[PDB]
């Protein structure tokens, strides 16, 4: 028993982190096979970031200008190319620690682990979610760019995020490993405001199921609701609309606990309308939305 | 910017996890050098756990009864001994992945990362604290015993916890790597109730400093207090008494923010007396106490 915000074990990803320096900028790179992936803004000076023309800046860079260091040993760069907002630096050595991997572009509401790195060295690992406004609420200081987000399924690492920037509001924006930003964000130091940060309703319901499984049941009530009735309340509280796909995904949790999805929606509806009255659920005084139904099943079953 | 409950990168510890089976019980072991450490209750059947005589049960076990598997390869056990509540299984092969390590016995209030494992395979990593009642609030299912807690200082892993049991209240108890339980707990399936779970005051103050650094400042007030005045309020709310040692440890955070420790205590005093009024601090509606002052400095400075 017990339910924690758990990250995937990070070892497989730690073996892929390298330091990339171009001119006076140093950030992190991800070394998989004979390619090092890093944010293209490694070629920028803080001044260039105001209005960078990446194709123009890249013409002034050659293979020898990209310094790639794995631990204390230098990698030889034999090619470089820009794909969207990432640079792909071809090196002469395949990473011996390359795990089985995929590049995936996640949907908002999905969770992943971030291995925060500085100078190619891992500092910590935490779990987060792609917010519905395509930002993430991470913990990233200067030098953390190029740190990656990932999920692990047995022995295959699915990389989904690479860190690029912090908006002036302290939230984070990045790309998938193809270099495409999540959301409308651009790698320029300009006014970029995030949209509404709505709550991931299906994740809140999954976490309420996790609470019931782990013994926290005070919030269960005698009511039920419909998808349309629940959604009138979800809209009012800036919660994402719940669809039948979300109800289907919650099926296994509904079956395990014996609590119908719409009954759990009615509990959530009363929590939204009345608050927690100074009570807590799974050690939280807020309705937690960074656990997917898959995360709840995995943690409650012990998937390794 | 941003502040997350961050765990240490777990790779160094993942390379130490093995599966230990004795009879029909399978749990995790920690392989460092040529020794595998695991809870001594690996020799028990669920029935033995009611009133186990470990010395008597161990006489019926020989080296060949301890099956140790690292990945898919078997380790040869050439010796075994019991030290307090852990068994030390001497194997014929030193773990090639043994990192630089120490065994430390932590104090209540200190934090560490747990690599939850099942069948010797890592499932996830999370951060927690040794509670003042010597329990931890983890996420452990059956098969997780032998999972370890640790801290990392550059390249040295300090192991501080090994998981042994879950109390009937869903909280967790374990030992240091010398096999001595934290608190009064025993490895027997009997009535063991935890004492008061007080709040780690110095950690709450550290987290309020982290909030100020990261932009959450609404709770700062025009007041100050004294250690004795603050402690009258801390006692009332089941908070640990704050000492001058705690004030000294908060010195660097006080210096960085320019907010005197006793002024932050006065903010905390008003938060205890008035609540948050539906507001949040660092994405929490509760006063977070599982970040030490060292954790705040580390995360706010980017230690790798
Ligand atoms: C969601 N609107 C009411 C509200 C504000 N804050 C909250 C925290 C928890 C909860 F269950 C409800 C609330
Ligand atoms: C600590 N006693 C009041 C109280 C109950 N619950 C709380 C949650 C947050 C906070 F700042 C204060 C409170």
Swiss-Prot record, chains A, B:
Record note on what altering residue 49 to A does: Does not affect ability to cleave and inactivate human TRMT1
Q: What does the UniProt entry list as the effect of changing residue 205 to V?
A: In strain: Zeta/P.2
The source's domain of life comes to Viruses
Note the effect listed for residue 132 to H: In strain: Omicron/BA.1, Omicron/BA.2, Omicron/BA.2.12.1, Omicron/BA.2.75, Omicron/BA.4, Omicron/BA.5, Omicron/BQ.1.1, Omicron/XBB.1.5, Omicron/EG.5.1
Catalytic activity, reaction form = TSAVLQ-|-SGFRK-NH2 and SGVTFQ-|-GKFKK the two peptides corresponding to the two self-cleavage sites of the SARS 3C-like proteinase are the two most reactive peptide substrates. The enzyme exhibits a strong preference for substrates containing Gln at P1 position and Leu at P2 position
Please list the residue ranges annotated as the Peptidase C30 domain: 1-304
Glycyl lysine isopeptide (Lys-Gly) (interchain with G-Cter in ubiquitin) cross-link: located at 5, 90
Activity regulation, in the record's words, is:
Inhibited by pyridone-containing alpha-ketoamides compounds 13a and 13b. In turn, alpha-ketoamide 13b (tert-butyl (1-((S)-1-(((S)-4-(benzylamino)-3,4-dioxo-1-((S)-2-oxopyrrolidin-3-yl)butan-2-yl)amino)-3-cyclopropyl-1-oxopropan-2-yl)-2-oxo-1,2-dihydropyridin-3-yl)carbamate) inhibits SARS-CoV-2 replication in human lung cells. Inhibited ex vivo by michael acceptor inhibitor N3. Inhibited ex vivo by compound 11a and 11b.
Q: Which residues form the active site?
A: 41, 145
Effect noted on mutating residue 145 to A: Complete loss of 3C-like proteinase nsp5 cleavage
The cellular location(s) given in this protein's UniProt record come to:
Host cytoplasm; Host Golgi apparatus; Host nucleus
The residues exposed to the Cytoplasmic compartment are 1-304
The record describes its quaternary structure and partners as: 3CL-PRO exists as monomer and homodimer. Only the homodimer shows catalytic activity. Interacts with host FBXO22; this interaction promotes the proteasomal degradation of nsp5.
Task performed by this protein: Cleaves the C-terminus of replicase polyprotein at 11 sites. Recognizes substrates containing the core sequence [ILMVF]-Q-|-[SGACN]. Cleaves and inactivates human TRMT1, preventing tRNA guanine(26)-dimethylation of tRNAs. May cleave human NLRP1 in lung epithelial cells, thereby activating the NLRP1 inflammasome pathway. May cleave human GSDMD, triggering alternative GSDME-mediated epithelial cell death upon activation of the NLRP1 inflammasome, which may enhance the release interleukins 1B, 6, 16 and 18. Also able to bind an ADP-ribose-1''-phosphate (ADRP).
**Name this protein carries in UniProt:** 3C-like proteinase nsp5
**Gene assigned in the entry:** rep
């Amino acid at each position: 028993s017990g339910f924690r915000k758990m990250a995937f074990p990070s070892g497989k990803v730690e073996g892929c982190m390298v330091q990339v320096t171009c001119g006076t900028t140093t950030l992190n790179g991800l070394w998989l096979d004979d390619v090092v992936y890093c944010p293209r803004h490694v070629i920028c000076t803080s001044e260039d970031m105001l209005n960078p023309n990446y194709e123009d800046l890249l013409i002034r860079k050659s293979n020898h200008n990209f310094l790639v260091q794995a631990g204390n040993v230098q990698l030889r760069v034999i090619g470089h190319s820009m794909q969207n907002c990432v640079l792909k630096l071809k090196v002469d050595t395949a990473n011996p620690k390359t795990p089985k991997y995929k590049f995936v572009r996640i949907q908002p509401g999905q969770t992943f682990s971030v291995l925060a790195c500085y100078n190619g060295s891992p500092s910590g690992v935490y779990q987060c979610a792609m917010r519905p406004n395509f930002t993430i609420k991470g913990s990233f200081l200067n030098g953390s760019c190029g740190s990656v987000g990932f999920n692990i399924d047995y022995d295959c690492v699915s990389f989904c995020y690479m860190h690029h920037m912090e908006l002036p509001t302290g939230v984070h924006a990045g790309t998938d490993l193809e270099g495409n930003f999540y959301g409308p964000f651009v790698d320029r130091q300009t006014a970029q405001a995030a949209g509404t940060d709505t709550t991931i309703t299906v994740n809140v319901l999954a976490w309420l199921y996790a609470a019931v499984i782990n013994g926290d049941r005070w919030f269960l009530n005698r009511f039920t609701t419909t998808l349309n009735d629940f959604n009138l309340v979800a809209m009012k509280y800036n919660y994402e609309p719940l669809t039948q796909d979300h109800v289907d995904i919650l099926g296994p949790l509904s079956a395990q606990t014996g609590i119908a999805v719409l009954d759990m929606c009615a509990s959530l509806k009363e929590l939204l309308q009345n608050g927690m009255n100074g009570r807590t659920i799974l050690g939280s005084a807020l309705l937690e939305d960074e656990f997917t139904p898959f995360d709840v099943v995995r943690q409650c079953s012990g998937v390794t």
